[PDB]
Design an enzyme around this catalytic site. Structure first.
Site, PDB file in Angstrom:
ATOM      1  N   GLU A  68      -3.191   0.424  -3.225  1.00 42.41           N
ATOM      2  CA  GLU A  68      -4.609   0.276  -2.945  1.00 42.41           C
ATOM      3  C   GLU A  68      -5.528   0.656  -4.085  1.00 42.41           C
ATOM      4  O   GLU A  68      -6.730   0.381  -4.024  1.00 42.41           O
ATOM      5  CB  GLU A  68      -4.961   1.200  -1.754  1.00 42.41           C
TER       6      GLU A  68
ATOM      7  N   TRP B 139     -12.614   3.831   5.079  1.00 44.19           N
ATOM      8  CA  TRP B 139     -12.617   4.914   4.110  1.00 44.19           C
ATOM      9  C   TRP B 139     -13.846   5.808   4.107  1.00 44.19           C
ATOM     10  O   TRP B 139     -13.936   6.776   3.360  1.00 44.19           O
ATOM     11  CB  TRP B 139     -12.459   4.323   2.690  1.00 44.19           C
TER      12      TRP B 139
ATOM     13  N   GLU C 262       0.780  -1.235   0.000  1.00 43.95           N
ATOM     14  CA  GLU C 262       0.000   0.000   0.000  1.00 43.95           C
ATOM     15  C   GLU C 262       0.814   1.290   0.000  1.00 43.95           C
ATOM     16  O   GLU C 262       0.547   2.224   0.760  1.00 43.95           O
ATOM     17  CB  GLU C 262      -0.978   0.034   1.207  1.00 43.95           C
ATOM     18  N   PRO C 263       1.811   1.407  -0.887  1.00 45.14           N
ATOM     19  CA  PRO C 263       2.597   2.642  -0.935  1.00 45.14           C
ATOM     20  C   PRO C 263       1.680   3.851  -1.141  1.00 45.14           C
ATOM     21  O   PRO C 263       0.825   3.861  -2.022  1.00 45.14           O
ATOM     22  CB  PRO C 263       3.513   2.424  -2.142  1.00 45.14           C
ATOM     23  N   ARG C 264       1.965   4.921  -0.373  1.00 44.05           N
ATOM     24  CA  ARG C 264       1.278   6.205  -0.514  1.00 44.05           C
ATOM     25  C   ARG C 264       2.340   7.300  -0.407  1.00 44.05           C
ATOM     26  O   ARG C 264       3.423   7.130   0.144  1.00 44.05           O
ATOM     27  CB  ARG C 264       0.228   6.456   0.575  1.00 44.05           C
TER      28      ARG C 264
ATOM     29  N   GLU D  36      -6.736  -7.017  -1.696  1.00 44.63           N
ATOM     30  CA  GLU D  36      -7.165  -7.020  -0.311  1.00 44.63           C
ATOM     31  C   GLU D  36      -8.600  -6.526  -0.256  1.00 44.63           C
ATOM     32  O   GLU D  36      -8.915  -5.570  -0.971  1.00 44.63           O
ATOM     33  CB  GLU D  36      -6.389  -6.118   0.650  1.00 44.63           C
TER      34      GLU D  36
END
Ligand SMILES: *[C@@H]1O[C@H](CO)[C@@H](O)[C@H](O)[C@H]1NC(C)=O
Ligand SMILES: *[C@@H]1O[C@H](CO)[C@@H](O)[C@H](O)[C@H]1NC(C)=O
Ligand SMILES: *[C@@H]1O[C@H](CO)[C@@H](O)[C@H](O)[C@H]1NC(C)=O
Ligand SMILES: *[C@H]1O[C@H](CO)[C@@H](O)[C@H](O)[C@H]1NC(C)=O
Length: 344
Positions: free
Chosen positions: A205, A247, A169-171, A276
Protein backbone atom coordinates in the site's frame (compact mmCIF):
# COMPACT_ATOMS: atom_id res chain seq x y z
CA UNK A 1 2.44 -5.81 -31.32
CA UNK A 2 2.31 -8.15 -28.33
CA UNK A 3 5.68 -8.15 -26.53
CA UNK A 4 6.74 -8.60 -22.93
CA UNK A 5 5.99 -5.55 -20.77
CA UNK A 6 9.17 -3.66 -19.94
CA UNK A 7 10.38 -0.35 -18.47
CA UNK A 8 11.89 2.28 -20.75
CA UNK A 9 13.25 5.28 -18.84
CA UNK A 10 10.82 5.76 -15.90
CA UNK A 11 7.86 4.77 -18.06
CA UNK A 12 6.27 1.50 -19.04
CA UNK A 13 6.57 0.08 -22.58
CA UNK A 14 3.38 -1.89 -23.36
CA UNK A 15 3.35 -3.55 -26.80
CA UNK A 16 5.97 -1.09 -28.03
CA UNK A 17 4.18 2.01 -26.78
CA UNK A 18 6.00 3.98 -24.13
CA UNK A 19 3.82 6.17 -21.98
CA UNK A 20 1.36 6.52 -19.11
CA UNK A 21 -1.38 3.87 -18.77
CA UNK A 22 -4.74 3.58 -17.09
CA UNK A 23 -6.04 0.25 -15.77
CA UNK A 24 -8.42 -1.23 -13.23
CA UNK A 25 -8.76 -3.77 -10.42
CA UNK A 26 -10.94 -6.82 -11.14
CA UNK A 27 -10.06 -9.29 -8.37
CA UNK A 28 -13.16 -11.36 -9.08
CA UNK A 29 -12.36 -11.92 -12.78
CA UNK A 30 -10.14 -14.83 -11.71
CA UNK A 31 -13.07 -16.74 -10.14
CA UNK A 32 -15.60 -16.53 -12.94
CA UNK A 33 -16.59 -20.04 -14.07
CA UNK A 34 -18.45 -19.03 -17.24
CA UNK A 35 -15.90 -18.18 -19.95
CA UNK A 36 -18.39 -15.87 -21.62
CA UNK A 37 -18.37 -13.61 -18.52
CA UNK A 38 -14.59 -13.26 -18.62
CA UNK A 39 -14.78 -12.28 -22.29
CA UNK A 40 -17.63 -9.76 -21.88
CA UNK A 41 -15.88 -8.11 -18.96
CA UNK A 42 -12.51 -7.93 -20.77
CA UNK A 43 -14.18 -6.66 -23.92
CA UNK A 44 -15.64 -3.77 -21.90
CA UNK A 45 -12.34 -2.98 -20.18
CA UNK A 46 -10.49 -3.03 -23.54
CA UNK A 47 -13.09 -0.92 -25.38
CA UNK A 48 -12.94 1.63 -22.54
CA UNK A 49 -9.24 2.14 -23.32
CA UNK A 50 -7.75 0.55 -20.22
CA UNK A 51 -4.63 -1.51 -20.78
CA UNK A 52 -3.96 -3.33 -17.51
CA UNK A 53 -6.13 -5.40 -15.14
CA UNK A 54 -5.23 -6.53 -11.59
CA UNK A 55 -6.71 -9.97 -10.76
CA UNK A 56 -6.27 -12.28 -7.75
CA UNK A 57 -3.67 -15.04 -8.35
CA UNK A 58 -4.79 -16.89 -5.22
CA UNK A 59 -7.79 -18.68 -3.69
CA UNK A 60 -6.63 -20.43 -0.54
CA UNK A 61 -8.71 -22.78 1.58
CA UNK A 62 -8.25 -25.06 4.60
CA UNK A 63 -11.33 -27.20 3.85
CA UNK A 64 -12.30 -28.06 0.29
CA UNK A 65 -15.34 -26.09 -0.76
CA UNK A 66 -18.55 -27.63 -1.92
CA UNK A 67 -18.05 -29.58 -5.13
CA UNK A 68 -18.04 -27.12 -8.07
CA UNK A 69 -16.70 -24.14 -6.11
CA UNK A 70 -13.37 -22.65 -7.12
CA UNK A 71 -10.25 -23.19 -5.10
CA UNK A 72 -6.56 -22.82 -6.15
CA UNK A 73 -4.79 -24.27 -3.08
CA UNK A 74 -5.75 -26.29 0.01
CA UNK A 75 -3.40 -25.64 2.92
CA UNK A 76 -2.98 -28.45 5.43
CA UNK A 77 -0.47 -29.47 8.07
CA UNK A 78 -0.50 -32.98 6.58
CA UNK A 79 0.11 -32.11 2.94
CA UNK A 80 -1.18 -29.24 0.84
CA UNK A 81 -2.74 -29.52 -2.60
CA UNK A 82 -2.47 -27.10 -5.56
CA UNK A 83 -5.60 -27.47 -7.73
CA UNK A 84 -4.81 -27.56 -11.46
CA UNK A 85 -8.22 -28.95 -12.42
CA UNK A 86 -11.29 -27.31 -13.94
CA UNK A 87 -12.46 -25.85 -10.60
CA UNK A 88 -8.88 -24.68 -9.94
CA UNK A 89 -6.10 -22.92 -11.89
CA UNK A 90 -7.77 -23.74 -15.22
CA UNK A 91 -10.10 -20.80 -14.37
CA UNK A 92 -7.05 -18.47 -14.20
CA UNK A 93 -5.73 -20.01 -17.45
CA UNK A 94 -8.80 -18.75 -19.31
CA UNK A 95 -8.31 -15.30 -17.76
CA UNK A 96 -4.78 -15.13 -19.12
CA UNK A 97 -6.02 -16.49 -22.56
CA UNK A 98 -8.72 -13.80 -22.62
CA UNK A 99 -6.25 -11.08 -21.69
CA UNK A 100 -4.06 -12.30 -24.65
CA UNK A 101 -7.10 -12.08 -26.93
CA UNK A 102 -8.24 -8.64 -25.72
CA UNK A 103 -4.81 -7.03 -25.76
CA UNK A 104 -4.78 -6.60 -21.99
CA UNK A 105 -1.93 -7.09 -19.50
CA UNK A 106 -2.39 -8.55 -15.98
CA UNK A 107 -0.93 -7.81 -12.53
CA UNK A 108 -1.19 -11.03 -10.46
CA UNK A 109 -0.48 -11.21 -6.69
CA UNK A 110 0.21 -14.65 -5.15
CA UNK A 111 -1.24 -14.32 -1.64
CA UNK A 112 -3.56 -11.94 0.26
CA UNK A 113 -2.42 -10.14 3.42
CA UNK A 114 -6.12 -10.20 4.40
CA UNK A 115 -8.29 -13.26 5.12
CA UNK A 116 -10.45 -12.85 2.02
CA UNK A 117 -9.88 -15.90 -0.20
CA UNK A 118 -7.77 -17.38 2.58
CA UNK A 119 -4.76 -15.18 2.83
CA UNK A 120 -1.96 -15.33 5.33
CA UNK A 121 -4.59 -16.53 7.85
CA UNK A 122 -5.16 -19.74 5.79
CA UNK A 123 -1.40 -20.46 6.05
CA UNK A 124 -1.49 -19.71 9.81
CA UNK A 125 -4.36 -22.23 10.24
CA UNK A 126 -2.24 -24.93 8.59
CA UNK A 127 1.30 -24.04 9.71
CA UNK A 128 0.89 -22.29 13.04
CA UNK A 129 2.49 -19.06 14.22
CA UNK A 130 0.58 -15.86 13.54
CA UNK A 131 0.18 -13.21 10.84
CA UNK A 132 3.53 -11.53 11.58
CA UNK A 133 5.59 -14.70 12.00
CA UNK A 134 4.23 -15.94 8.63
CA UNK A 135 7.12 -14.25 6.77
CA UNK A 136 9.66 -16.47 8.53
CA UNK A 137 7.57 -19.64 9.11
CA UNK A 138 9.53 -22.28 7.18
CA UNK A 139 6.59 -24.58 6.43
CA UNK A 140 4.39 -21.68 5.35
CA UNK A 141 7.09 -20.14 3.14
CA UNK A 142 7.92 -23.53 1.57
CA UNK A 143 4.30 -24.01 0.52
CA UNK A 144 3.94 -20.37 -0.56
CA UNK A 145 7.00 -20.78 -2.85
CA UNK A 146 5.57 -24.06 -4.23
CA UNK A 147 2.41 -22.10 -5.07
CA UNK A 148 4.43 -19.26 -6.65
CA UNK A 149 6.19 -21.85 -8.86
CA UNK A 150 2.87 -23.41 -9.83
CA UNK A 151 1.42 -20.10 -11.02
CA UNK A 152 4.55 -18.56 -12.58
CA UNK A 153 5.41 -21.70 -14.57
CA UNK A 154 2.04 -21.64 -16.28
CA UNK A 155 2.40 -18.15 -17.68
CA UNK A 156 6.14 -17.39 -17.74
CA UNK A 157 6.24 -17.16 -21.53
CA UNK A 158 2.95 -15.32 -21.99
CA UNK A 159 3.11 -11.68 -23.17
CA UNK A 160 -0.10 -10.92 -21.23
CA UNK A 161 1.53 -10.71 -17.80
CA UNK A 162 2.25 -7.10 -16.78
CA UNK A 163 3.98 -8.14 -13.55
CA UNK A 164 4.11 -10.79 -10.86
CA UNK A 165 3.19 -9.34 -7.44
CA UNK A 166 4.40 -10.83 -4.17
CA UNK A 167 1.12 -10.25 -2.36
CA UNK A 168 -1.92 -8.03 -1.98
CA UNK A 169 -1.10 -5.33 0.59
CA UNK A 170 1.48 -7.22 2.68
CA UNK A 171 1.83 -5.81 6.21
CA UNK A 172 3.69 -6.90 9.37
CA UNK A 173 1.86 -5.02 12.10
CA UNK A 174 4.26 -3.64 14.71
CA UNK A 175 7.21 -5.47 13.14
CA UNK A 176 10.67 -4.16 12.28
CA UNK A 177 10.44 -2.99 8.65
CA UNK A 178 13.37 -5.32 7.86
CA UNK A 179 11.11 -8.42 8.03
CA UNK A 180 9.31 -7.47 4.79
CA UNK A 181 12.56 -6.13 3.27
CA UNK A 182 14.29 -9.50 3.69
CA UNK A 183 11.26 -11.56 2.67
CA UNK A 184 10.59 -9.39 -0.39
CA UNK A 185 14.26 -9.57 -1.40
CA UNK A 186 14.32 -13.37 -1.20
CA UNK A 187 10.93 -14.02 -2.83
CA UNK A 188 11.48 -11.54 -5.72
CA UNK A 189 14.86 -13.18 -6.39
CA UNK A 190 13.02 -16.52 -6.51
CA UNK A 191 10.43 -15.21 -8.99
CA UNK A 192 13.23 -13.85 -11.22
CA UNK A 193 14.83 -17.34 -11.12
CA UNK A 194 11.62 -18.82 -12.53
CA UNK A 195 10.90 -16.18 -15.17
CA UNK A 196 13.31 -13.69 -16.77
CA UNK A 197 10.71 -12.18 -19.09
CA UNK A 198 8.50 -10.36 -16.59
CA UNK A 199 8.52 -7.43 -14.17
CA UNK A 200 8.07 -8.09 -10.39
CA UNK A 201 6.57 -5.77 -7.73
CA UNK A 202 5.68 -6.00 -4.03
CA UNK A 203 1.95 -5.07 -3.98
CA UNK A 204 2.17 -3.00 -0.79
CA UNK A 205 0.00 0.00 0.00
CA UNK A 206 3.00 2.31 0.30
CA UNK A 207 2.86 2.75 4.07
CA UNK A 208 5.90 4.21 5.85
CA UNK A 209 7.39 7.28 4.13
CA UNK A 210 9.03 10.15 6.00
CA UNK A 211 8.38 12.95 3.49
CA UNK A 212 4.68 13.19 4.35
CA UNK A 213 2.62 15.00 6.96
CA UNK A 214 2.89 12.46 9.78
CA UNK A 215 -0.58 10.94 9.38
CA UNK A 216 -0.66 7.23 10.36
CA UNK A 217 -0.19 5.87 6.80
CA UNK A 218 3.18 7.70 6.59
CA UNK A 219 4.37 6.23 9.95
CA UNK A 220 6.01 2.81 10.44
CA UNK A 221 3.30 0.94 12.33
CA UNK A 222 2.60 -1.66 9.62
CA UNK A 223 6.08 -3.05 9.10
CA UNK A 224 6.74 -1.41 5.75
CA UNK A 225 9.27 1.29 4.67
CA UNK A 226 8.42 2.42 1.15
CA UNK A 227 11.81 3.87 0.23
CA UNK A 228 13.62 0.77 1.52
CA UNK A 229 11.31 -1.58 -0.39
CA UNK A 230 11.50 0.19 -3.72
CA UNK A 231 15.32 0.08 -3.65
CA UNK A 232 15.28 -3.76 -3.72
CA UNK A 233 17.05 -4.70 -6.96
CA UNK A 234 14.68 -7.53 -7.88
CA UNK A 235 11.59 -5.28 -7.61
CA UNK A 236 11.18 -3.31 -10.86
CA UNK A 237 8.61 -0.65 -9.83
CA UNK A 238 6.80 0.60 -6.74
CA UNK A 239 3.14 0.23 -5.86
CA UNK A 240 0.95 2.30 -3.54
CA UNK A 241 -2.77 2.27 -2.67
CA UNK A 242 -5.06 5.00 -1.30
CA UNK A 243 -8.15 4.86 0.97
CA UNK A 244 -8.82 8.04 2.99
CA UNK A 245 -12.16 6.65 4.23
CA UNK A 246 -10.44 3.64 5.77
CA UNK A 247 -7.43 5.58 7.01
CA UNK A 248 -9.02 8.53 8.76
CA UNK A 249 -7.68 11.21 6.38
CA UNK A 250 -9.59 13.60 4.16
CA UNK A 251 -9.81 13.00 0.39
CA UNK A 252 -7.62 15.95 -0.68
CA UNK A 253 -4.74 14.53 1.40
CA UNK A 254 -4.55 11.90 -1.35
CA UNK A 255 -2.82 14.36 -3.72
CA UNK A 256 0.16 14.67 -1.40
CA UNK A 257 0.17 10.87 -0.92
CA UNK A 258 0.59 10.46 -4.71
CA UNK A 259 3.28 13.19 -4.93
CA UNK A 260 5.42 11.82 -2.10
CA UNK A 261 5.31 8.25 -3.41
CA UNK A 262 6.08 9.34 -6.98
CA UNK A 263 9.14 11.21 -5.77
CA UNK A 264 10.37 8.16 -3.83
CA UNK A 265 9.99 5.93 -6.90
CA UNK A 266 11.82 8.47 -9.10
CA UNK A 267 14.59 8.78 -6.49
CA UNK A 268 15.03 4.97 -6.72
CA UNK A 269 15.11 5.30 -10.52
CA UNK A 270 11.87 3.45 -11.18
CA UNK A 271 8.23 4.09 -12.02
CA UNK A 272 5.42 3.98 -9.45
CA UNK A 273 1.97 2.43 -10.09
CA UNK A 274 -0.99 4.02 -8.24
CA UNK A 275 -2.42 0.53 -7.96
CA UNK A 276 -5.59 0.88 -5.88
CA UNK A 277 -7.71 3.89 -4.89
CA UNK A 278 -11.31 4.68 -4.06
CA UNK A 279 -13.68 7.07 -2.29
CA UNK A 280 -16.98 5.89 -0.79
CA UNK A 281 -18.58 9.34 -0.92
CA UNK A 282 -18.84 11.38 -4.15
CA UNK A 283 -16.24 9.41 -6.13
CA UNK A 284 -16.42 11.56 -9.27
CA UNK A 285 -15.70 14.74 -7.28
CA UNK A 286 -13.13 13.24 -4.93
CA UNK A 287 -11.19 10.84 -7.19
CA UNK A 288 -10.86 12.97 -10.35
CA UNK A 289 -8.22 15.23 -8.78
CA UNK A 290 -6.18 12.16 -7.84
CA UNK A 291 -6.25 10.91 -11.42
CA UNK A 292 -5.03 14.32 -12.63
CA UNK A 293 -2.28 14.46 -10.00
CA UNK A 294 -1.05 11.00 -11.01
CA UNK A 295 -1.11 11.78 -14.74
CA UNK A 296 0.87 15.00 -14.23
CA UNK A 297 3.47 13.90 -11.65
CA UNK A 298 6.94 12.77 -12.68
CA UNK A 299 7.68 9.23 -11.46
CA UNK A 300 4.14 7.95 -12.03
CA UNK A 301 3.78 5.29 -14.73
CA UNK A 302 0.07 4.55 -14.46
CA UNK A 303 -2.98 4.26 -12.24
CA UNK A 304 -5.62 1.59 -11.50
CA UNK A 305 -8.85 2.42 -9.67
CA UNK A 306 -10.56 0.01 -7.25
CA UNK A 307 -12.70 -1.42 -8.76
CA UNK A 308 -14.42 -2.57 -11.97
CA UNK A 309 -18.06 -3.67 -11.74
CA UNK A 310 -19.84 -5.44 -14.57
CA UNK A 311 -22.88 -7.55 -15.44
CA UNK A 312 -23.25 -10.77 -17.45
CA UNK A 313 -25.35 -12.18 -20.27
CA UNK A 314 -27.58 -14.09 -17.84
CA UNK A 315 -28.47 -10.92 -15.91
CA UNK A 316 -26.23 -11.59 -12.89
CA UNK A 317 -23.96 -8.84 -11.58
CA UNK A 318 -20.34 -9.21 -10.54
CA UNK A 319 -19.07 -9.13 -7.00
CA UNK A 320 -18.95 -5.51 -5.75
CA UNK A 321 -18.34 -3.16 -2.81
CA UNK A 322 -18.96 0.55 -2.07
CA UNK A 323 -16.05 1.55 -4.33
CA UNK A 324 -17.29 -0.28 -7.44
CA UNK A 325 -17.47 1.77 -10.62
CA UNK A 326 -20.04 -0.02 -12.79
CA UNK A 327 -19.34 -0.25 -16.54
CA UNK A 328 -21.34 2.25 -18.61
CA UNK A 329 -22.50 4.23 -15.56
CA UNK A 330 -22.16 7.97 -14.88
CA UNK A 331 -19.10 7.24 -12.69
CA UNK A 332 -17.62 5.16 -15.58
CA UNK A 333 -17.98 8.32 -17.76
CA UNK A 334 -16.30 10.48 -15.11
CA UNK A 335 -13.51 8.18 -13.89
CA UNK A 336 -12.90 5.89 -16.88
CA UNK A 337 -13.85 7.47 -20.24
CA UNK A 338 -12.91 11.08 -19.31
CA UNK A 339 -9.62 9.91 -17.75
CA UNK A 340 -8.60 7.73 -20.72
CA UNK A 341 -9.49 10.72 -22.97
CA UNK A 342 -7.15 12.99 -20.95
CA UNK A 343 -4.27 10.50 -21.18
CA UNK A 344 -4.71 10.27 -24.92
C1 LIG B 1 2.99 -13.19 17.19
O1 LIG B 1 3.94 -14.20 17.52
C2 LIG B 1 5.18 -13.58 17.89
C3 LIG B 1 6.15 -14.68 18.26
O2 LIG B 1 5.62 -15.48 19.26
C4 LIG B 1 4.86 -12.71 19.13
O3 LIG B 1 6.09 -12.14 19.57
C5 LIG B 1 3.81 -11.63 18.81
O4 LIG B 1 3.42 -10.96 20.00
C6 LIG B 1 2.56 -12.33 18.35
N1 LIG B 1 1.47 -11.43 17.91
C7 LIG B 1 0.31 -11.32 18.60
C8 LIG B 1 -0.66 -10.35 18.03
O5 LIG B 1 0.05 -11.92 19.56
C1 LIG C 1 10.53 -19.10 -21.85
O1 LIG C 1 11.05 -17.97 -21.15
C2 LIG C 1 12.28 -18.34 -20.50
C3 LIG C 1 12.73 -17.11 -19.70
O2 LIG C 1 11.91 -16.89 -18.56
C4 LIG C 1 13.30 -18.67 -21.63
O3 LIG C 1 14.50 -19.13 -21.02
C5 LIG C 1 12.74 -19.85 -22.46
O4 LIG C 1 13.62 -20.10 -23.58
C6 LIG C 1 11.38 -19.51 -23.02
N1 LIG C 1 10.74 -20.69 -23.65
C7 LIG C 1 10.55 -20.78 -24.99
C8 LIG C 1 9.98 -22.10 -25.42
O5 LIG C 1 10.84 -19.88 -25.72
C1 LIG D 1 -23.19 0.47 -23.12
O1 LIG D 1 -23.75 1.73 -23.51
C2 LIG D 1 -23.87 1.79 -24.93
C3 LIG D 1 -24.57 3.13 -25.18
O2 LIG D 1 -23.65 4.17 -24.93
C4 LIG D 1 -24.68 0.58 -25.40
O3 LIG D 1 -24.66 0.63 -26.84
C5 LIG D 1 -24.10 -0.80 -25.00
O4 LIG D 1 -25.02 -1.89 -25.19
C6 LIG D 1 -23.98 -0.75 -23.51
N1 LIG D 1 -23.29 -1.96 -23.00
C7 LIG D 1 -23.93 -2.79 -22.16
C8 LIG D 1 -23.13 -4.02 -21.84
O5 LIG D 1 -24.98 -2.57 -21.74
C1 LIG E 1 -7.73 18.40 4.85
O1 LIG E 1 -6.46 17.96 5.20
C2 LIG E 1 -5.39 18.88 5.04
C3 LIG E 1 -4.35 18.39 6.03
O2 LIG E 1 -4.23 17.00 5.94
C4 LIG E 1 -5.87 20.33 5.29
O3 LIG E 1 -4.76 21.22 5.08
C5 LIG E 1 -7.01 20.72 4.32
O4 LIG E 1 -7.47 22.04 4.59
C6 LIG E 1 -8.17 19.80 4.59
N1 LIG E 1 -9.13 19.80 3.45
C7 LIG E 1 -10.46 19.59 3.63
C8 LIG E 1 -11.31 19.96 2.45
O5 LIG E 1 -10.91 19.20 4.62
Amino acid sequence: ASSFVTISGTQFNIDGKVGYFAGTNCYWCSFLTNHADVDSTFSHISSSGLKVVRVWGFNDVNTQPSPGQIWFQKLSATGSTINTGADGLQTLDYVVQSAEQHNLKLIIPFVNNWSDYGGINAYVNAFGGNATTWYTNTAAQTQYRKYVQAVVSRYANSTAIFAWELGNEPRCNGCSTDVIVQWATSVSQYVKSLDSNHLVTLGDEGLGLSTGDGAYPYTYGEGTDFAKNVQIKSLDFGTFHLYPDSWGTNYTWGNGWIQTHAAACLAAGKPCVFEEYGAQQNPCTNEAPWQTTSLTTRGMGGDMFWQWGDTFANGAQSNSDPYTVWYNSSNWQCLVKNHVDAIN
